[PDB]
Design a protein around this ligand. Structure first.
Ligand SMILES: Nc1ncnc2c1ncn2[C@@H]1O[C@H](COP(=O)(O)OP(=O)(O)OP(=O)(O)O)[C@@H](O)[C@H]1O
Ligand SMILES: Nc1ncnc2c1ncn2[C@@H]1O[C@H](COP(=O)(O)OP(=O)(O)OP(=O)(O)O)[C@@H](O)[C@H]1O
Lengths: 401, 401
């Protein structure tokens, strides 16, 4: 038996994510779907509207076999590091394939571009050279080099988000040396975006988005809103970011991952007079910082992650551990087969390992749950250490916990 | 001009404080009352019920001519350190008189006990070490070495808080040889304890205290809760203690003022499983910590005040500046008469002067607004800067700002 990897934030799990998990198998030919998922803070820098334990329960019912956490180390990063770490994880798990979405059903222009950029990298990087000399910025210089080779209309659209993610997936397998086959199909009960679906529940109104949500999801959601009493938004953390930037020194704020040299001063001026995450971000955005990148930096400023430590962990060539959130009986079976071949530990309960990348995952949790009104917060906190992998039986509805 | 020094924290200012301010000017023959008081976080360790700005106005309308902030540096401290710098600042302002209420209306056992203990201070450390070398503990060997004297019928229980602080103002004066004469009287439309009042306001009673609280003071409290929607309590900050203990390693928390070696692990461990600030404490209790010492510590954790910060600042034998919060007609002329005499910065606008001890007070003023809901909180943080030091017209009630 053979495995198809999916890189997913599942924010939340909806019918579209279903179209992914089912097409993957049919198109690749693998009877096993393994997803590596961003746990509590995602690639664009925002918190998951629900815990990674809940979203696991949803995915395990909707056709994913193994749910592995994408360590925070790799998860809050722009696409290439995100892809590098997530593709390493799928590599560790011997997935025969990688199934990623774009607005194209075709895996070809991802391929053709990759080599082109793979082979021209010298020409390219020598072409970035010449341009800085003319006094242009680096993004300028980079844009000028790309366009010489890449203005041939291939045409890979490096705008459409998930295509960028596709390119870096294909990229990472290529410089990785992984025996992995990238697949893909076109994105599209017509299906809704995860975004618009989020606004729904955020408006307290989860009823709008139901037909777009698989059944298992709605309950687990309703159960999560019933269990812990909120849905999680970025504005839930503003109060704690405001504490963070209060209790730090501009020398200390310089060392937080993604705070570039000099910005820490602008950072502190803005936060004092910022009455919302919205306003704060409004005072923050620069030419040097995209919207999303600020959400990333702000999340780091939330977990108080230092550059040096982050540099330490990125230097590792492979995922430090395999963090097991959940599994079906196929998942369990696929795992126990390959487990002996896993070269890094397999974490199910947190007492089975100690690594700096994992405290980071645990810390992210302890921060993530802050919005839950006490005592309800503390019950939640028992989960990271408490919650053992969630086990579903595809012979319907058996959770064994 | 003659001024009487008042060492106070008005939380709130009650009938015991109003009587204490009028008898201050009566019994000490001074035309002016100068108060040094804790701004936002106090000696007992807890947050002020209401901002230093408003509590100032319960004082100016109750007979205090001048109000200076006791910096966090001295304010949140053991009673030996607290008394020292309060007295230090009142002597800086050239107060010729000091006035404190007490469980012992008698200064004489205070001047006795003080003059008594130094006469023997060699006899003590010997009986201490003689107990110490015999395996006795610190407070035991001291309680034995101290009960080797003083233990006559005199009482003056220094098991009583007022006698403790009172002995400590007097000690700082004698040991300092200040030209400032100390005064005391016993503790007695009515009069209650600020604490039994406080717990009465937490018990959803305000006008209940109107028997036990003056007009201005009661006028001032309502308009606060009106604007910011709260009275500040220790629990209110619990979420920020969780959050702050959730980012910090053992080593770094180890470096926090008043965190004893190895107590970090217990703290980090205890905060996890505590769904209440009260629960957080019981777990933390070890005989080397009183409850106040544990409350004082939770403050230094919140504000992230470090041992090296503190000891470096505690070391000096003078006060770093005079922060002026507010004043009367009388108070102004006194500040104008003694202005040129101050050997340290008179800080009216915060803009004028920056000092690490000053950095500390503002950091505490930012931590103080945190339970306040925005947009109010963002505006509350305006007060530490663009607030003209308050001024009030003694004769027929006018604030000039
Ligand atoms: N309707 C859909 N059609 C095709 N692929 C989908 C669909 N919904 C999700 N996927 C795929 O599922 C995987 C995980 O999705 P993820 O949680 O990252 O959402 P997303 O596609 O980024 O959301 P959005 O569509 O709002 O941009 C990705 O490979 C994604 O392309
Ligand atoms: N009712 C009272 N009788 C006598 N002295 C008082 C009274 N209230 C306050 N004082 C004195 O006024 C001084 C300033 O007190 P502070 O503002 O520190 O409050 P406190 O003494 O902690 O409160 P409490 O009055 O509840 O003990 C203290 O030294 C205290 O002894």
């Amino acid at each position: 038996m053979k495995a198809v990897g999916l890189v997913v934030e599942y924010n939340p799990f909806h019918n579209g994510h279903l179209y992914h998990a089912q097409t993957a198998k049919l198109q690749t030919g693998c009877d096993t779907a393994v997803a590596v998922m961003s746990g509590h803070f995602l690639q664009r820098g925002e918190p998951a509207v629900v815990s990674k334990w809940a979203r696991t329960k949803m995915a395990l019912q909707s056709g994913v076999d193994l749910v592995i956490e994408l360590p925070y180390l790799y998860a809050v990063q722009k696409a290439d590091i995100f892809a590098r770490g997530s593709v390493s994880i799928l590599n560790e798990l011997e997935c025969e394939a990688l199934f990623f979405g774009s607005e194209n059903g075709d895996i070809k222009p991802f391929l053709e571009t990759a080599q082109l950029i793979d082979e021209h990298k010298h020409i390219l990087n020598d072409r970035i050279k010449e341009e800085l000399k003319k006094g242009a910025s680096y993004p300028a210089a980079a844009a000028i080099a790309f366009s010489s080779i890449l203005h041939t209309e291939s045409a890979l659209d490096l705008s459409k988000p998930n295509n960028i993610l596709g390119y870096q997936y294909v990229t990472s397998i290529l410089t990785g040396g992984y025996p992995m086959k990238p697949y893909t199909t076109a994105r599209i009960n017509h299906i809704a975006s995860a975004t618009s679906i989020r606004k729904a529940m955020i408006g307290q109104n989860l009823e709008a988005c139901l037909r777009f949500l698989p059944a298992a999801s709605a309950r687990e959601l309703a159960a999560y809103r019933k269990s812990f009493g909120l849905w999680h938004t970025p504005e839930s953390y503003f109060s704690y970011l405001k504490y963070s930037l209060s209790t730090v020194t501009a020398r200390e704020l310089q060392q937080v991952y993604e705070v570039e040299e000099g910005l820490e001063h602008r950072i502190i001026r803005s936060i004092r007079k910022s009455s919302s995450y919205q306003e704060f971000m409004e005072l923050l955005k620069t030419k040097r910082y995209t919207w999303t990148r600020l959400q990333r930096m702000n999340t780091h400023i939330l977990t108080r992650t230092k550059k040096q430590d982050m540099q330490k962990l990125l230097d590792n060539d492979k995922a430090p551990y395999i963090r097991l959130l959940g599994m079906t009986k196929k998942g369990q079976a696929y795992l126990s087969e390959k487990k002996k071949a896993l070269s890094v530990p397999l974490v199910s309960k947190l007492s089975s390992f100690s690594h700096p990348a994992l405290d980071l995952d645990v810390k992210a949790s302890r921060i993530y749950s802050l919005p839950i009104e006490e005592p309800l917060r503390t019950e939640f906190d028992l989960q990271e250490y408490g919650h053992a992998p969630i086990r579903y039986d595809e012979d319907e509805q058996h959770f064994l916990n």
